[PDB]
Nucleic acid binder design. Structure first.
Ligand SMILES: [Zn+2]
Ligand SMILES: [Zn+2]
Length: 92
RNA sequence: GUCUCGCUUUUCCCC
């Protein structure tokens, strides 16, 4: 009676950014050490972003060949902080 | 366009 919600699921809290230099063929670090993500031809990459695997983000993937991005522990933590900010509802 | 995407939340609300 005093709240509202988006018609569709908000993917913005599950997406991670693709490296600017990886998209140019100029980056020189593995996905594990770079500041951003290095997806494959099989990932659902769009507009320099990819939706990350929820099960992997929680520390235990539940598939064997999933279409989402698997980020390193530091980026998993940044993604969970972005998710938690909605549970905390800091904006309201 | 599976792109409204296979998981969309760590519990009201967010979603
Ligand atoms: Zn890079
Ligand atoms: Zn996975």
């Amino acid at each position: 009676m005093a709240v509202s919600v988006t018609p569709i699921r908000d993917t913005k809290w599950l997406t991670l950014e693709v490296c600017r230099e990886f998209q140019r063929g100029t980056c020189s670090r593995p996905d594990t050490e770079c500041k951003f993500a290095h997806p494959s031809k099989s990932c659902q990459v769009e507009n320099g972003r990819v939706i990350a695997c929820f099960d992997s983000l929680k520390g235990r993937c539940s598939r064997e060949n999933c279409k989402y991005l698997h980020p390193p522990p530091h980026l998993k933590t940044q993604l969970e902080i972005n998710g938690r900010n909605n549970l905390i509802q800091q904006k309201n």
